[PDB]
Inverse folding.
């Protein structure tokens, strides 16, 4: 069975620069049925290149590919905002058909600080017995970010649940949500709840808070 | 009896696959007063100046009759083009073959996708085999060459056969 | 033209038999060279070819999926089916069908998520995330919608029935104790809220639930 290994496993790329992805086949077959697909996070894979070098119609010509034996190379140049995706090579030369492991391409952009918003438990959730405190940290860059939850000045580590969006295909930012889960009883013991965002864009954290007795 | 233009195909295959390219060439005379050529498909005008006509990516609808004319070389006899659907096609440059004339056949794949382990068959029997797709070329046709021909080859891990074509050796 | 749409059960219990259907248009499985294949992808993982069927009923199978796989086609109704037997949690993945040919895979379907689990189909609770009074004195105001305690994926979150799309962030769900929790944010001018209405529409097909919550102070 043919093993396809892609290098690099991940790449950060500047707007307009050439990006190269290598796919190495364990076996050589004399054009080889080597195909390339682009998969944007929410969607199916989409064919880019078929049979080593053939550009699929409707795909811009800044995608191209070439094969040098067991050495197959995808080239994107210039790279655009909308190329943030995972790229897969794939062989139809022999059963079973196999894919490469994927190369995750991400875009670089100017640093952007998160827009931070904090939200207390709603009444509905409180009546039902639970208490969730929600913090949004939207449209920032780079993706690295740290959230610190406080309850009346004391950091709370347990109960926090964090989720990041995939890179935005238009503006190359990221966003993140941070959700602190409590019960109604342990919530109504304390007054002030704080979301604290540490990011490259500031020496000082961004601090958003609310007081239950607002 | 008025002199006529003549159509030629490049390549000379008159049976082609969808997405193939075809160049049609017009042999005809010009004069300082007019150097234009007109092309007709199914008797409708498709081009009014250029000597050649290029089909970039053939569709089934490009099948049919083609004619050309110049002012001095009148409307050509038609040349027929067949655009077939499918993955594999046995191509021939003409319909009839006289004895001692060459027979040139090609096992043609869709978009010229690479073909391995290719057999050309006559009346059900393996006639010629290549590991890499080559043309079938009989240098001197004999009447024993008449028959039903098709070809078959391996595409990666799947064999495909073309449909049959009747090859008739005449005089 | 060519399109493919997969269908599954959303959720089935382990050791059961997964039934998948692929319905296609724009080509016919009677044409020489055409085939339909199945590929799967665990969340955040790579792609694994499972099986495909050719126009001549020749069927090829991943030799690692034992003999659990069975692919069939129906030329009359333009459909292809895949059966996986004896499923376990490692079979949870998005399942794609694709129109292929002997040299590449040409068109893929949208994919269908299949979760293999014994947990119970719980519909989501929806909670509004309303700004405080101080937040409204900024130029832009961010509102939200918390979708808690549902199972299995997926949910579909819209705002103002799709009229609000710029500046929406619907976050990936997180899995806790057989229950999923996602949130969704939307950002609008404070000159539009709470003057113009803003409501989120959550949908959970697996439980046939559809809910809307308006956002108020
Ligand atoms: C010029 O005239 C020729 C001769 O009438 C036309 O060729 C014919 O075109 C039709 C429509 O494309 C072909 O039928 C189609 O064939 C395929 C393949 O079997 C099938 O998938 C379709 O459903 C359809 O029936 C017909 O075979 C063909 N005749 C031939 C190739 O000898 C041509 O369309 C005309 N073109 C123009 C611009 O008028
Ligand atoms: C294709 O035909 C040849 C001749 O028998 C042989 O390699 C094989 O049986 C067929 N199938 C495949 C998948 O190669």
């Amino acid at each position: 069975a043919i093993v396809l290994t892609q290098s690099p496993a991940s790449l950060a790329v500047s707007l307009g620069q050439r990006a190269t992805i290598s796919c190495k086949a364990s076996q050589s077959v004399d054009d080889s049925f080597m195909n390339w697909y682009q998969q944007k996070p929410g969607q199916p894979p989409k064919l880019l290149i078929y049979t080593t070098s053939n550009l699929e119609s409707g795909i811009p010509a800044r995608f191209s590919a070439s094969g040098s034996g067991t050495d197959f190379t995808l080239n994107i140049h210039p790279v655009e905002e909308e190329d943030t995706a995972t790229y897969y090579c794939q062989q139809s030369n022999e059963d079973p058909y196999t894919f490469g492991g994927g190369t995750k391409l991400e875009l670089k952009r100017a640093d952007a600080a998160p827009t931070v918003s904090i939200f207390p438990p709603s009444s509905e959730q409180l009546t039902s017995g639970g208490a969730s405190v929600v913090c949004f940290l939207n449209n920032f860059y780079p993706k690295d970010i740290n959230v610190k939850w406080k309850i009346d000045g004391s950091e709370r580590q347990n109960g926090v649940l964090n989720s990041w969006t995939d890179q935005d295909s238009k503006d190359s930012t990221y966003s993140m949500s941070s959700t602190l889960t409590l019960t109604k009883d342990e919530y109504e013991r304390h007054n002030s709840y704080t979301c604290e965002a540490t990011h490259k864009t500031s020496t000082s954290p961004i601090v958003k808070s609310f007081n239950r007795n607002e | 009896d008025l002199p006529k233009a003549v159509v030629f195909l490049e390549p000379q295959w008159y049976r082609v696959l969808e997405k193939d390219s075809v160049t049609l060439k017009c042999q005809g005379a010009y004069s300082p007063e007019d150097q234009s050529t007109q092309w007709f498909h199914n008797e409708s005008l498709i081009s009014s100046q250029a000597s050649s006509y290029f089909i970039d990516a053939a569709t089934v609808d490009d099948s049919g009759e083609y004619r050309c004319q110049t002012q001095l070389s009148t409307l050509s006899d038609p040349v027929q083009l067949e655009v077939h659907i499918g993955w594999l096609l046995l191509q021939a440059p003409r319909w009839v073959f006289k004895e001692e004339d060459p027979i040139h056949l090609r096992c043609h794949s869709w978009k010229n996708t690479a073909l391995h382990k290719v057999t050309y068959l006559q009346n059900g029997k393996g006639r010629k085999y290549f590991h890499h797709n080559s043309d079938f070329y009989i240098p001197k046709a004999t009447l024993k060459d008449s028959g039903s021909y098709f070809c078959r080859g391996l595409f990666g891990s799947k064999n495909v056969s073309s449909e049959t074509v009747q090859i008739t050796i005449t005089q | 033209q060519v399109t493919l749409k997969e269908s599954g059960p959303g959720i089935l219990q382990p050791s059961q038999t997964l039934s998948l259907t692929c319905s296609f248009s724009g080509f016919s499985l009677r044409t020489s060279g055409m085939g339909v294949g199945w590929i799967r992808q665990p969340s955040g993982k790579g792609l694994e070819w499972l099986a495909h069927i050719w126009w001549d009923d020749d069927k090829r199978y991943n030799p690692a999926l034992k003999s659990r796989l069975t692919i069939s086609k129906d030329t009359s109704s333009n459909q292809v089916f895949l059966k996986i037997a004896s499923v376990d949690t490692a079979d949870t993945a998005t399942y794609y069908c694709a129109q292929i040919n002997p040299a590449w895979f040409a068109y893929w379907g949208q994919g269908t998520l299949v979760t293999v689990s014994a947990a119970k189909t719980t519909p989501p609770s929806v909670y509004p995330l309303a700004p405080g009074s101080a937040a409204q004195t900024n130029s832009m105001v961010t509102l939200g919608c918390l979708v808690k305690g549902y199972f299995p994926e997926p949910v579909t979150v819209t705002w103002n029935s799709g009229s609000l799309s710029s500046g929406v962030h619907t976050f990936p769900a997180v899995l806790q104790s057989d229950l999923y929790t996602l949130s969704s944010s939307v950002t609008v001018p404070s000159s539009t809220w709470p003057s113009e209405t803003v409501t989120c529409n959550v949908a959970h097909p697996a439980s046939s639930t559809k809910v809307d919550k308006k956002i108020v102070p």
Q: What stands out?
A: The two ends of chain C are 48 Å apart (CA to CA). The longest strand of chain C covers residues 140-150. Chain C has no helices and 19 strands. Residues B 41-42, 60-61, 63-64, 82, 85 surround ligand 1 (CB under 6 Å).
